[PDB]
Amino acid sequence: MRMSSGNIGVYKLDDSRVDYELARELYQNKNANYKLGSSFVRPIVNSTTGFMGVPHFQIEDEEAQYILDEFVLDNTSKMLKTHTDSLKQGDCYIWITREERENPLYPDKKVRLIYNFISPEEVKEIILDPTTKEPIAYILESQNEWTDLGENKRKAKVKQIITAESRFVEVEGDKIEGLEEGETPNVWGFIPIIHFKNEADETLKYGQSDIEPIEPLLKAYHDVMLHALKGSKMHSTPKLKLKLTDVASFLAHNFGVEDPVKFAKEGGKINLDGHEILFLNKDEEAEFVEVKSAIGDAKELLKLLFYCIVDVSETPEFIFGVHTPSALASVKEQMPIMVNKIRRKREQFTNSWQLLARMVLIMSKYSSYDVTIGWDEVNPRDDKELAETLEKVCCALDKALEGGFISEESTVNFLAQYIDTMSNYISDDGEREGEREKIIKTKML
Amino acid sequence: MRMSSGNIGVYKLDDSRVDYELARELYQNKNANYKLGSSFVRPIVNSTTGFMGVPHFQIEDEEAQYILDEFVLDNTSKMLKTHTDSLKQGDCYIWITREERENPLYPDKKVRLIYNFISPEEVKEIILDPTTKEPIAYILESQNEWTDLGENKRKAKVKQIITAESRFVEVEGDKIEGLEEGETPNVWGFIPIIHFKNEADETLKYGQSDIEPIEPLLKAYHDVMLHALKGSKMHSTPKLKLKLTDVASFLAHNFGVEDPVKFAKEGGKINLDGHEILFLNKDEEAEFVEVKSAIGDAKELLKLLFYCIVDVSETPEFIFGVHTPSALASVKEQMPIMVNKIRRKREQFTNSWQLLARMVLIMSKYSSYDVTIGWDEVNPRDDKELAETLEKVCCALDKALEGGFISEESTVNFLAQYIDTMSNYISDDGEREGEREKIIKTKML
Amino acid sequence: MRMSSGNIGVYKLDDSRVDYELARELYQNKNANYKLGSSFVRPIVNSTTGFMGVPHFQIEDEEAQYILDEFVLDNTSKMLKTHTDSLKQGDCYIWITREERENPLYPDKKVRLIYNFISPEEVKEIILDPTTKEPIAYILESQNEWTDLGENKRKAKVKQIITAESRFVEVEGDKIEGLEEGETPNVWGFIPIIHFKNEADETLKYGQSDIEPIEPLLKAYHDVMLHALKGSKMHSTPKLKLKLTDVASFLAHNFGVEDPVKFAKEGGKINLDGHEILFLNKDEEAEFVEVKSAIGDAKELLKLLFYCIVDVSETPEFIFGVHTPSALASVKEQMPIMVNKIRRKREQFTNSWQLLARMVLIMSKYSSYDVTIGWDEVNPRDDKELAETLEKVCCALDKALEGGFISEESTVNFLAQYIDTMSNYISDDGEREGEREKIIKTKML
C-alpha cells in the first residue's frame, strides 16, 4: 500500500527472538493448543532438512581439504542436526572447541576439535558492533544441575562471556571441576562460536523458525478440528427419542429406576444391547432424532487451511499426498520445485558454513582459506547419462584437431565431475564415502 | 510466535524420560485405552527400522576390518534390534562385554565380545560431565527374580554403578554365582556402555520416541472409533416398534411374558426367526424406527486423523495403501521420499555406531580408529545399470590418452564400488553375503 | 508420553508367555468368540512363513558345509515347520537328538541326528543364568497317554529336566521302555535343545505370537460381524403387516387356526407359497414393514477394522487383494514392501539358526563353526539380467589392463553368485536343489 516519504518511521533493528520452547513443543506436537494443528510442522522441517545435504567443503589446498573432510567424517550428523535445529528454532549456535585431553577411547587422537552445540536458550544476548555488525561477545547463561558420581545432588547457575581475545566464566553455586573460574585467554583473536541464522533478514538480529508463518494457520486448523470432534462426539450418534404416556412408570417398569432424579444425579447410564424392540400403546411414539452431518462445513474449511499451510511453506505437495493422492503419480515431475526450494534455502546457510570451515582451518599456513561449498544432489544425476555425455564428448573430441589442447583440460574436468558424482552414494548423506574410498585406495595402493 | 529477547527464563536440560511401558504396550497394541488407536504404531516403527538396514563399518586397516566384519556377522540381528529399540522406546543402551569363559558350545571362539542389551528401565540415572555432557558413570538397578536349578525360587535385587575407572556391583537378596560383589576394576579406562539416542535433542537427556508426537492423535482415533462402534452396536440395527391397543395382552398371548416388569428386570429376551407376519387390529400400528447413520460423520474424522498421523510420522503413503489404493500405483515413485527419510534417520545413530566400532576395535595397535560407516541400499541401483556405467567408462577411457594414469584409479574405484553393490545381497540384511563370499573365496584360493 | 526421571519402577523381566492353546485355536479359526474375526490370522502367518525360506547354512569348511547341507536335505520341511510354529505360537522349542538305532528302513544310515520338536506347552519353565541369561536347564513336562501294540491303554505323566551336564528324566505311571529313568549323562556340555523366540524383546523372557497385537481387533471384527448377522437374520426379510377388522376370524378362515394363542405356543409357522392375493374389505389394510438397510453402518466399521488389522500386521495388500482388487494391478510393485518386512523378520531367527548350524556341526575338528546364513529370494533375481551383468562385466574387463588380476577374483565370485542363483529352483523351497545337482555332477563325473 502506498505511503508518502515523509510519513515513515526510523529504522530499528529487531532484537526479538523466537519462542524456542513453543517451537520445540510444536515440533514435538506437545502444545495443547496446537496438537491437532501442528501435524504439519514435522513433515515440512524433516523434508527440507533431508533434501538439503551437508556442505561439501572444497578447497584447492590439499592439507586444508584433508582437514575439512576429516571434520566432515567426524561431524556430518552434527552438521545435519545443525541444519534441522536452525530451521526448527531459527537460531542454532555452534561452538567449536579444541581439547587435548587424554582418554583411552581416543588412543591415536590426542587433539580433538569438538563440535559442541549451544542451544538458543543459552545465548541470553549477543554483543553487536554498531558499525561492521560482527558480533563482539556472547553472554551465555545456563542452569547446570547435575548428579554426583556417588549420590549428591549439585546445582549451579553458570554464565560465561565469550569474547574474541578472551572468555570470562563465573559460576554461582556448587563447584564445576571442568571449568576454571575467572577469565582465561582466547588462543585466537576471534570468537569460535558461529551463529547460524535461518531465514536471516537485514532488519532482524536473530534467525527465524520456518514454523512461524504457518503458526496462526496451525491454530486455526487445531481449533476447527477440536470443535468438529467435540460436536461429533456430542451429536454424531443418533439420540433415540420416546414420546411416552408416563415417563416415570415407563422407566420403573423397564429398568427398575424408581428414583429417576437420583438416577440422573448418579450418572445412571442405561444398558442397551442393540437388539431392542418398542412395545408401545396406541398413541405412544418413538423416533430417532438424527442429524444429516454433525460436522457441518468443517471439512471444506480444513481443506482450505491445509492448502493455505502448504502454500505458505511452499513445499512440493508429494510430501502431503495423503490429502491429494494424485500428486504421487509423478514425484519426479515435482522434483524441480524441490530443487528450486532447496537452492533458495542452501544460500541461507552456505555463507555461515564457509565461515565455519574457515574457522576450522584456522583452528588446526594453508595457501588459502576461501572454501567453496558444494551440496548433495536433490534428485540424483544419472551416472549412465553422465557416462553417455563423457563418451560422446570423447568421441566428439580428437576430431577436427585445430581446437587445441584445451580438450584435455575439459576431459579431465568432466572425468573429475563424474568421479565425484559416482563415488558419492546417493542413499548415503554427505561426501564421507568419497573420502573413505580415497583413503582405502591410498592405503591399498 | 515472536517475543522480546529479555523476557525468557534460564536454560535447563530436561531429564524427562519416555513412558517405556506405555510405548511398548502401544507397539504391541495391548493398552486398553489405545487398542484401536495403537494400530498405526507398528507399521511406522517397522517400516522405519526396516528401510534402513545396519551400518557397514568401513576401515582401511585389514585387521580392523576383519574384527569389524566378524562382529557384524555375530551381531547383525542384535544391531537391527538396537535400531528397533531406539525407534520404539526412544532410548537404547548397548553393553559389549569381553568374555573369555570356556564352554564346549564354542570350541574355537575362546574369547567373545558379548553384545548384551540394557533395558531403558534398567538404568535409573546417567552421570554426565557438566563441561562436555560426556557420561562419567551409569546408574543401573534391576530385580533379578529367578529360579534355582533345583526347585527353589531366588529373589535378587541388584544395583551396579559402571564407571570408566571401575565397575561397582551390590546385590540385596539371594546369591548370584556369576557376579563378584563390590568394586572390580575395568581393564580399560572407558565406560563399556553406549547410550543410543533416538531423535536427539540438544536440550534433552534421553532420546525421543517417534511414537510420542502421534500419541494424542492415536488417543483421538481410539476415542472416535470407540464412540462410533458403541453407537453402531446401540443403534445400527433397526428397532421394531408396535403401537398396540394393549401391550400386556399381546405379550401374554404371543410370547407368554405373563409378568413383563419381572421379564425386563430379569433381563429375559424373546426369540425370533425373521420369517414373521404381523396380524394387527385396525387402530394399532407397527413400523420400524431406523437411523440414517449410526456413525454420524465419523468416517471423515477418521480419515482426517489418519492423514494427520501419517503427516506427523512423515511416512510414505504406500505403507498405508489400504486407505489410499492409488498410492500402490507406483511405489518406486514414492521411494525417493523413503530415501530422504532414511538419509535423515541414519545420521541419528551413525555417530553412536562409530563410537561402538571404535570401542570394539579398542576392546579387541590398529593404524586407525576412525570408522566411516556405509549402509544398506534403500533403492538399490540395477547391477545392469552399474555394469553399463562401468563399460561406458571403460570404453570412454583408454581414448584421448593425454588424461594420464588417473583413469586407473577411477576405474579400480568404480570396480570396487560395483563389487560392493553386486555382492551385497539386496533381500538379506547387512553385508554377510560379501564377507561370506570373501572368506569362501579365500579358503578356495 | 513424557515423565520425570524419578517416577519409574524397577525393571522386571516378563515371565508371561502366549496363551498357546488360544493361539492354535485362532490359527485354526476354532475359537467361538473369534471364528468370523480370526479369518485374517491364517493369511498373515502363511504369507510371512512362505515368503521367508529356510536358512542357507554357508561355511568355508568343506566337511562342515557337507554336514550342513545333509541336515538341510533331511529337515527343510521341519525347518519350515519351525518357522510357522514360532510365528503362530511365539515360542517353538527344537530338540536335536542323536540316535544310533538300527532298523531296516535306514540301511545305510546307522546314526541319525533327529530333528525332534517340543511344543511350547511341554516347556513348563526354563532356568536362566542371572548374569549371562543363557538357558541353563529346561523343565519339560508332558502327559504321555498311549496305547499298547495289543489292546491295553497306558497312561504316564512324564517330566524331564534337561541340563548341560546331564538330563534327569522321571515318569509317574506306566512304564515307558525307550526312556531310562533317572539321570543320564549328556554327551556334550550344552543342552541339546534350541529355543526359537519370535518377536523377542530384552524385557521379555519368551517370544510372542504375531496374532496378539491384532487379537483385540479380531474380537471387535468378530463381534461386529456377529451382531450384523443377527440383525440381518432378524430384520432383513420384510415383515408383512395386516391391519384386520377381525384377526381371530381371519386366522381361522385362512389357515384353520382355531386357537391363535395355542398356534403361537406350538411354534406354528404358516405356509406361504409366494403367489398370494389379498381380498380385504374397505377398512382392512395390508402393508410391508421394510427397512432401508438392516445393517445400518456395520460395513464401514468392518472396513475400518480390516484396515487397522492390515496396518497392525503391516502386510502388503496383495495378501488381502480381495477387499481392494486395485492392489492386484502390480504385485511386483508391492514386492519391495514384502522384501522389507521379510528382511526385518529374518533377523529375528537368523541368530538362532546360526546357533543351530554351529550345534549341528558340533554334534557330528572343522576349521570353523561360524556359519553365515543366506536366505531364499523373496522376488527372484532374473537370470537373464544376471547373465547380462556377467557378459557386460566380462567385456568391460580385459580392457585397460592396468587394473590388475583382481578381475579374475571378481569374475569367479560373480560366476559363483550366478551359479547359486540359477541352480536353486525358485518355485521350490530351499537350496536342496543345488546340493542335489552337485551330488549328481560328482557321481556322473
Side-chain angles (χ1 to χ4, degrees), chain B residues 15-17 19 27 46 50-51 77 85 117 122 124 147 212 215 236 256 273-274 278 280 282 285 293-295 321 331 391 425, chain C residues 1-3 5 11 127 199 202 233 237 240 242-244 265 283 295 297 314 317 333 340 343-344 346 350 362 370 377 392 395:
Chain B
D15 63 347
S16 196
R17 322 183 88 93
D19 190 0
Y27 169 71
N46 295 322
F51 266 101
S77 282
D85 292 6
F117 279 98
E122 280 268 337
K124 196 76 204 69
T147 56
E212 280 158 272
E215 281 172 349
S236 178
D273 194 15
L278 269 70
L280 273 291
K282 301 306 312 314
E285 274 286 328
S293 170
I295 56 171
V331 172
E391 185 185 18
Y425 182 39
Chain C
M1 209 158 179
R2 282 276 148 184
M3 67 195 292
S5 297
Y11 159 80
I127 305 304
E199 183 65 26
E202 60 205 31
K233 187 180 182 295
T237 186
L240 184 55
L242 286 81
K243 291 224 297 299
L244 297 163
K265 304 299 174 190
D283 276 336
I295 293 289
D297 300 338
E314 64 270 352
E317 292 85 317
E333 198 73 28
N340 186 86
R343 266 205 327 265
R344 197 171 72 73
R346 282 162 170 173
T350 187
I362 290 158
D370 304 337
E377 286 153 75
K392 200 169 277 288
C395 73

Coordinates of all heavy atoms in Angstrom, one line a residue, chain B residues 15-17 19 27 46 50-51 77 85 117 122 124 147 212 215 236 256 273-274 278 280 282 284-285 293-295 321 331 391 425, chain C residues 1-3 5 11 127 199 202 233 237 240 242-244 265 283 295 297 314 317 333 340 343-344 346-347 350 362 370 377 392 395, unseen atoms left out:
Chain B
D15 N 15.6 -33.7 32.0 CA 15.9 -35.1 32.4 C 14.7 -36.0 32.2 O 14.8 -37.2 32.6 CB 16.3 -35.1 33.9 CG 15.2 -34.6 34.8 OD1 14.2 -34.1 34.4 OD2 15.4 -34.9 36.1
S16 N 13.6 -35.6 31.6 CA 12.5 -36.4 31.5 C 12.7 -37.6 30.6 O 13.6 -37.6 29.7 CB 11.3 -35.6 30.9 OG 10.1 -36.2 31.2
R17 N 11.9 -38.7 30.8 CA 12.0 -39.9 30.1 C 10.8 -40.1 29.3 O 9.7 -39.5 29.6 CB 12.3 -41.1 31.0 CG 13.2 -40.8 32.2 CD 13.5 -42.1 33.0 NE 14.6 -42.9 32.5 CZ 15.8 -42.8 32.9 NH1 16.2 -41.9 33.8 NH2 16.8 -43.6 32.3
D19 N 7.7 -42.7 28.4 CA 7.0 -43.7 29.1 C 7.2 -45.1 28.3 O 6.6 -45.3 27.3 CB 5.5 -43.4 29.2 CG 4.8 -44.4 30.1 OD1 5.4 -45.3 30.7 OD2 3.6 -44.2 30.3
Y27 N 3.1 -50.4 21.0 CA 3.7 -51.1 20.0 C 3.1 -52.5 19.8 O 3.0 -53.0 18.7 CB 5.2 -51.2 20.2 CG 5.9 -52.1 19.2 CD1 6.0 -51.9 17.9 CD2 6.4 -53.3 19.7 CE1 6.6 -52.7 17.0 CE2 7.1 -54.2 18.9 CZ 7.2 -53.9 17.5 OH 7.8 -54.8 16.7
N46 N 8.1 -50.3 12.2 CA 8.7 -51.4 11.4 C 9.2 -50.9 10.0 O 10.3 -51.3 9.6 CB 7.6 -52.5 11.2 CG 7.2 -53.1 12.5 OD1 8.0 -53.4 13.3 ND2 5.9 -53.3 12.6
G50 N 13.1 -51.0 9.2 CA 13.5 -51.9 8.1 C 14.1 -51.2 6.9 O 15.1 -51.8 6.4
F51 N 13.6 -50.1 6.5 CA 14.1 -49.5 5.3 C 15.5 -48.9 5.4 O 16.2 -48.6 4.4 CB 13.2 -48.4 4.8 CG 12.2 -48.8 3.8 CD1 10.9 -49.1 4.2 CD2 12.5 -49.0 2.5 CE1 9.9 -49.5 3.3 CE2 11.6 -49.4 1.6 CZ 10.3 -49.7 1.9
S77 N 21.8 -59.2 13.7 CA 20.4 -59.2 14.2 C 20.3 -58.3 15.5 O 19.3 -57.6 15.6 CB 20.1 -60.7 14.6 OG 19.8 -61.4 13.5
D85 N 14.7 -50.9 18.9 CA 14.6 -50.5 20.3 C 14.7 -48.9 20.3 O 13.9 -48.3 21.0 CB 15.7 -51.1 21.1 CG 15.4 -52.6 21.3 OD1 14.5 -53.1 20.7 OD2 16.2 -53.2 22.1
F117 N 22.2 -56.4 25.9 CA 21.3 -55.2 25.9 C 21.1 -54.8 27.3 O 21.1 -55.6 28.3 CB 20.0 -55.6 25.2 CG 20.0 -55.6 23.7 CD1 20.2 -56.7 23.0 CD2 19.8 -54.3 23.1 CE1 20.2 -56.6 21.6 CE2 19.8 -54.3 21.7 CZ 20.0 -55.4 21.0
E122 N 16.2 -50.6 33.1 CA 17.3 -51.0 33.9 C 18.0 -49.8 34.5 O 18.4 -49.7 35.7 CB 18.3 -51.8 33.1 CG 18.0 -53.3 32.9 CD 18.6 -54.2 33.9 OE1 19.6 -53.9 34.6 OE2 18.0 -55.3 34.1
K124 N 18.7 -46.2 36.0 CA 17.9 -45.2 36.8 C 18.4 -43.8 36.6 O 17.6 -42.9 36.9 CB 18.1 -45.6 38.3 CG 17.1 -44.9 39.2 CD 15.7 -45.6 39.1 CE 14.6 -44.6 39.6 NZ 14.4 -43.5 38.6
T147 N 14.8 -68.6 39.2 CA 14.5 -69.9 39.8 C 15.8 -70.7 39.9 O 16.6 -70.8 39.0 CB 13.5 -70.7 39.0 OG1 14.0 -70.8 37.6 CG2 12.2 -70.0 39.0
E212 N 5.9 -40.6 20.2 CA 5.4 -39.5 21.2 C 4.6 -38.4 20.5 O 3.5 -38.1 21.0 CB 6.6 -39.0 21.9 CG 7.1 -39.8 23.1 CD 8.5 -39.5 23.4 OE1 9.4 -40.1 22.8 OE2 8.7 -38.6 24.3
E215 N 1.0 -39.8 19.7 CA 0.1 -40.3 20.8 C -1.2 -39.6 21.0 O -2.2 -40.3 21.2 CB 1.0 -40.3 22.1 CG 1.9 -41.5 22.2 CD 2.9 -41.3 23.4 OE1 2.9 -40.3 24.0 OE2 3.6 -42.3 23.7
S236 N -27.3 -49.2 15.2 CA -27.2 -49.5 13.8 C -28.2 -50.5 13.3 O -28.9 -50.2 12.3 CB -25.8 -50.1 13.5 OG -25.6 -50.4 12.1
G256 N -45.9 -65.3 25.9 CA -46.0 -65.9 27.3 C -45.3 -65.1 28.3 O -44.9 -65.7 29.3
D273 N -37.2 -65.5 14.5 CA -36.5 -66.2 13.4 C -36.4 -65.3 12.1 O -35.6 -65.6 11.3 CB -37.3 -67.5 13.0 CG -36.5 -68.4 12.1 OD1 -35.3 -68.2 11.9 OD2 -37.1 -69.3 11.5
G274 N -37.2 -64.2 12.1 CA -37.2 -63.3 10.9 C -38.4 -63.5 10.0 O -39.0 -62.5 9.6
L278 N -47.2 -60.0 10.7 CA -47.9 -59.2 11.7 C -49.4 -59.1 11.4 O -49.8 -58.6 10.3 CB -47.3 -57.8 11.8 CG -46.2 -57.6 12.8 CD1 -44.9 -58.4 12.3 CD2 -45.9 -56.1 13.0
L280 N -52.6 -57.4 12.8 CA -52.9 -56.3 13.7 C -54.4 -55.9 13.5 O -55.0 -56.1 12.5 CB -52.0 -55.1 13.4 CG -50.7 -55.0 14.1 CD1 -50.9 -54.8 15.6 CD2 -49.9 -56.3 13.8
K282 N -57.3 -52.7 13.7 CA -57.3 -51.5 12.9 C -56.5 -50.4 13.5 O -55.7 -49.7 12.9 CB -58.7 -51.1 12.6 CG -59.6 -52.1 11.9 CD -59.0 -52.6 10.6 CE -58.5 -51.5 9.6 NZ -59.4 -50.4 9.5
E284 N -54.2 -50.3 15.9 CA -52.8 -50.4 16.2 C -52.0 -50.3 14.9 O -52.5 -50.4 13.8 CB -52.6 -51.8 16.8
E285 N -50.7 -49.9 15.1 CA -49.8 -49.7 14.0 C -48.4 -50.3 14.4 O -48.1 -50.4 15.6 CB -49.7 -48.3 13.6 CG -50.7 -47.8 12.6 CD -50.4 -48.3 11.2 OE1 -49.2 -48.5 10.8 OE2 -51.4 -48.5 10.4
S293 N -27.7 -42.9 9.8 CA -26.3 -43.3 10.0 C -26.0 -43.3 11.5 O -26.0 -42.2 12.1 CB -25.3 -42.4 9.3 OG -24.0 -42.6 9.6
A294 N -25.7 -44.5 12.1 CA -25.3 -44.6 13.5 C -24.0 -43.9 13.7 O -23.8 -43.2 14.7 CB -25.3 -46.0 13.9
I295 N -23.0 -44.1 12.8 CA -21.7 -43.5 13.0 C -21.8 -42.0 12.9 O -20.9 -41.3 13.5 CB -20.7 -44.0 11.9 CG1 -21.3 -43.8 10.5 CG2 -20.4 -45.5 12.1 CD1 -20.2 -44.0 9.4
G321 N -1.3 -48.3 2.2 CA -2.0 -48.3 0.9 C -3.5 -48.8 1.0 O -4.2 -48.5 0.0
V331 N 5.0 -47.5 -6.2 CA 5.8 -47.5 -5.0 C 7.2 -46.9 -5.3 O 7.7 -46.1 -4.5 CB 5.9 -48.8 -4.3 CG1 6.9 -48.8 -3.2 CG2 4.5 -49.3 -3.9
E391 N 31.1 -50.3 -18.2 CA 31.6 -50.5 -19.6 C 31.7 -49.2 -20.3 O 32.6 -49.0 -21.1 CB 30.6 -51.4 -20.3 CG 31.0 -51.8 -21.7 CD 29.9 -52.6 -22.4 OE1 28.7 -52.6 -21.9 OE2 30.2 -53.3 -23.4
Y425 N 23.9 -58.6 -1.1 CA 22.6 -59.1 -1.5 C 21.5 -58.2 -1.0 O 21.4 -57.9 0.2 CB 22.4 -60.5 -0.9 CG 21.1 -61.2 -1.3 CD1 20.6 -61.1 -2.6 CD2 20.4 -62.0 -0.4 CE1 19.4 -61.7 -2.9 CE2 19.3 -62.7 -0.7 CZ 18.7 -62.5 -2.0 OH 17.6 -63.1 -2.3
Chain C
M1 N 4.4 -41.1 26.1 CA 4.2 -39.8 26.8 C 5.4 -39.6 27.8 O 6.0 -40.5 28.2 CB 2.9 -39.9 27.6 CG 2.3 -38.5 27.9 SD 0.5 -38.7 28.2 CE 0.0 -37.0 28.5
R2 N 5.7 -38.3 28.0 CA 6.9 -38.0 28.8 C 6.6 -38.2 30.3 O 5.4 -38.4 30.7 CB 7.2 -36.5 28.6 CG 8.0 -36.3 27.3 CD 9.5 -36.5 27.5 NE 10.1 -37.0 26.3 CZ 11.4 -37.4 26.2 NH1 12.2 -37.4 27.2 NH2 11.8 -37.8 25.0
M3 N 7.6 -38.3 31.1 CA 7.5 -38.5 32.6 C 8.9 -38.1 33.2 O 9.9 -38.2 32.5 CB 7.1 -39.9 32.9 CG 8.2 -40.9 32.6 SD 7.5 -42.6 32.6 CE 7.1 -42.8 34.3
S5 N 12.2 -38.3 35.6 CA 13.2 -39.3 35.8 C 13.0 -40.2 37.0 O 13.1 -41.4 37.0 CB 14.6 -38.8 35.8 OG 14.9 -38.1 34.6
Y11 N 13.0 -52.4 37.0 CA 12.8 -53.3 35.8 C 12.6 -54.7 36.3 O 13.3 -55.2 37.2 CB 14.0 -53.2 34.8 CG 14.1 -54.4 33.9 CD1 13.4 -54.5 32.8 CD2 15.1 -55.4 34.2 CE1 13.5 -55.5 31.9 CE2 15.2 -56.5 33.3 CZ 14.4 -56.5 32.2 OH 14.5 -57.6 31.3
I127 N 15.3 -72.5 33.2 CA 16.3 -71.9 34.2 C 17.2 -71.0 33.4 O 17.8 -71.4 32.4 CB 17.0 -73.1 34.9 CG1 16.0 -74.0 35.6 CG2 18.0 -72.4 35.9 CD1 15.0 -73.4 36.5
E199 N 9.7 -62.5 17.9 CA 9.4 -61.2 18.4 C 10.0 -61.0 19.8 O 9.4 -60.5 20.7 CB 7.9 -61.0 18.4 CG 7.3 -59.6 18.8 CD 7.8 -58.5 17.9 OE1 8.1 -58.7 16.7 OE2 7.8 -57.3 18.4
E202 N 14.2 -57.6 24.9 CA 15.1 -57.6 26.1 C 14.3 -57.6 27.4 O 14.8 -58.1 28.4 CB 16.1 -56.4 26.0 CG 15.4 -55.1 26.0 CD 16.3 -54.0 25.3 OE1 17.1 -54.3 24.4 OE2 16.2 -52.8 25.7
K233 N -30.5 -61.4 10.0 CA -31.4 -62.6 10.1 C -32.7 -62.2 10.8 O -33.8 -62.8 10.5 CB -30.8 -63.8 10.8 CG -31.6 -65.1 10.8 CD -30.8 -66.2 11.5 CE -31.6 -67.5 11.4 NZ -32.9 -67.4 12.1
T237 N -35.5 -59.9 6.0 CA -36.7 -60.3 5.3 C -37.8 -59.3 5.7 O -37.9 -59.0 6.9 CB -37.1 -61.7 5.7 OG1 -38.2 -62.1 4.9 CG2 -37.4 -61.9 7.2
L240 N -44.5 -58.8 6.6 CA -45.8 -58.4 6.1 C -46.8 -58.1 7.3 O -46.9 -58.9 8.2 CB -46.4 -59.5 5.2 CG -47.8 -59.2 4.5 CD1 -47.8 -58.0 3.7 CD2 -48.2 -60.4 3.7
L242 N -50.7 -56.8 8.4 CA -52.1 -56.7 8.1 C -52.9 -56.1 9.2 O -52.8 -56.5 10.3 CB -52.7 -58.1 7.8 CG -52.3 -58.8 6.5 CD1 -51.0 -59.5 6.6 CD2 -53.4 -59.8 6.1
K243 N -53.6 -55.0 8.8 CA -54.5 -54.3 9.8 C -55.9 -54.9 9.5 O -56.5 -54.5 8.5 CB -54.4 -52.8 9.6 CG -53.1 -52.2 10.1 CD -53.3 -50.9 10.9 CE -54.0 -49.8 10.1 NZ -53.2 -49.4 8.9
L244 N -56.4 -55.7 10.3 CA -57.6 -56.5 10.1 C -58.7 -56.1 11.0 O -58.5 -55.8 12.2 CB -57.3 -58.0 10.3 CG -56.2 -58.6 9.3 CD1 -55.7 -59.9 9.9 CD2 -56.8 -58.8 7.9
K265 N -48.0 -70.9 20.8 CA -47.2 -71.7 21.7 C -46.6 -72.9 21.0 O -45.5 -73.4 21.4 CB -48.1 -72.1 22.9 CG -48.7 -71.0 23.7 CD -47.7 -70.0 24.3 CE -48.4 -68.8 24.9 NZ -47.4 -67.8 25.3
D283 N -62.2 -51.3 5.1 CA -61.5 -50.8 6.3 C -60.1 -51.5 6.4 O -59.1 -50.8 6.7 CB -62.3 -51.1 7.6 CG -63.3 -50.1 7.9 OD1 -63.2 -48.9 7.5 OD2 -64.3 -50.4 8.6
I295 N -28.6 -53.5 8.3 CA -27.2 -53.4 8.8 C -26.9 -52.0 9.4 O -26.4 -52.0 10.6 CB -26.2 -53.7 7.7 CG1 -26.3 -55.2 7.2 CG2 -24.8 -53.4 8.2 CD1 -25.8 -56.2 8.2
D297 N -24.6 -49.3 9.6 CA -23.3 -48.7 9.4 C -22.2 -49.8 9.6 O -21.0 -49.4 9.7 CB -23.0 -47.5 10.2 CG -24.0 -46.4 9.9 OD1 -24.6 -46.4 8.9 OD2 -24.1 -45.5 10.8
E314 N 1.1 -54.9 9.2 CA 1.8 -54.3 8.1 C 2.1 -55.2 6.9 O 3.1 -55.2 6.3 CB 3.2 -53.7 8.6 CG 4.2 -54.7 9.1 CD 4.1 -55.0 10.6 OE1 3.4 -54.3 11.3 OE2 4.9 -55.9 11.0
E317 N -0.6 -55.4 0.6 CA -2.1 -55.5 0.4 C -2.5 -56.6 -0.6 O -3.6 -56.9 -0.7 CB -2.6 -54.2 -0.1 CG -2.6 -53.1 1.0 CD -1.2 -52.4 1.1 OE1 -0.2 -53.1 1.1 OE2 -1.2 -51.1 1.2
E333 N 5.0 -54.3 -8.0 CA 5.3 -53.0 -7.4 C 5.2 -53.1 -5.9 O 5.9 -52.3 -5.2 CB 4.2 -52.0 -8.0 CG 4.6 -50.6 -7.8 CD 5.7 -50.1 -8.7 OE1 5.8 -50.7 -9.8 OE2 6.4 -49.2 -8.4
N340 N 11.1 -55.7 2.5 CA 11.5 -55.0 3.7 C 11.0 -55.8 4.9 O 11.7 -56.0 5.9 CB 10.8 -53.6 3.7 CG 11.3 -52.8 4.9 OD1 12.3 -52.1 4.8 ND2 10.5 -52.8 5.9
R343 N 13.0 -59.0 5.3 CA 14.3 -58.7 5.8 C 14.3 -58.4 7.3 O 15.1 -58.9 8.1 CB 14.9 -57.4 5.1 CG 15.8 -57.7 3.9 CD 16.7 -56.5 3.7 NE 16.1 -55.2 4.0 CZ 15.5 -54.4 3.2 NH1 15.3 -54.6 1.9 NH2 15.0 -53.2 3.7
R344 N 13.3 -57.7 7.8 CA 13.1 -57.4 9.2 C 12.9 -58.7 10.0 O 13.4 -58.9 11.1 CB 12.0 -56.4 9.4 CG 12.0 -55.8 10.8 CD 11.0 -54.7 10.9 NE 9.6 -55.2 10.9 CZ 9.1 -55.8 12.0 NH1 9.7 -56.0 13.1 NH2 7.8 -56.2 11.9
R346 N 13.6 -61.9 9.1 CA 14.7 -62.9 9.1 C 15.7 -62.7 10.1 O 16.4 -63.7 10.6 CB 15.3 -62.9 7.7 CG 14.5 -63.6 6.6 CD 15.0 -63.2 5.2 NE 14.4 -64.1 4.2 CZ 14.5 -63.8 2.9 NH1 15.2 -62.8 2.4 NH2 13.9 -64.7 2.0
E347 N 16.0 -61.4 10.5 CA 16.9 -61.1 11.6 C 16.5 -61.6 12.9 O 17.4 -61.8 13.8 CB 17.2 -59.6 11.6
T350 N 17.7 -65.6 12.4 CA 18.9 -66.0 11.8 C 20.0 -66.2 12.9 O 20.9 -67.0 12.7 CB 19.4 -64.9 10.8 OG1 20.6 -65.5 10.1 CG2 19.8 -63.6 11.4
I362 N 28.8 -79.3 15.8 CA 29.4 -79.8 17.0 C 29.0 -81.2 17.2 O 29.8 -82.0 17.7 CB 29.1 -78.9 18.2 CG1 29.8 -77.5 18.0 CG2 29.5 -79.5 19.5 CD1 29.1 -76.4 18.9
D370 N 31.5 -70.8 12.6 CA 30.8 -69.6 12.5 C 30.0 -69.5 11.1 O 30.5 -68.9 10.2 CB 31.7 -68.4 12.6 CG 32.5 -68.4 13.9 OD1 32.0 -69.1 14.9 OD2 33.6 -67.8 14.0
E377 N 15.2 -66.1 -2.2 CA 14.8 -64.9 -2.8 C 13.3 -64.6 -2.6 O 12.5 -65.4 -3.0 CB 15.1 -64.9 -4.3 CG 16.6 -64.8 -4.6 CD 17.0 -65.5 -5.9 OE1 16.7 -65.0 -7.0 OE2 17.6 -66.6 -5.9
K392 N 28.5 -58.2 -19.5 CA 28.9 -56.8 -19.6 C 30.1 -56.6 -18.8 O 31.0 -55.8 -19.2 CB 27.7 -55.9 -19.1 CG 27.8 -54.5 -19.5 CD 26.5 -53.8 -19.2 CE 25.5 -54.0 -20.3 NZ 25.8 -53.3 -21.6
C395 N 33.1 -58.2 -20.8 CA 33.6 -57.4 -21.9 C 34.2 -56.1 -21.4 O 35.2 -55.6 -22.0 CB 32.5 -57.1 -22.9 SG 31.3 -55.9 -22.2

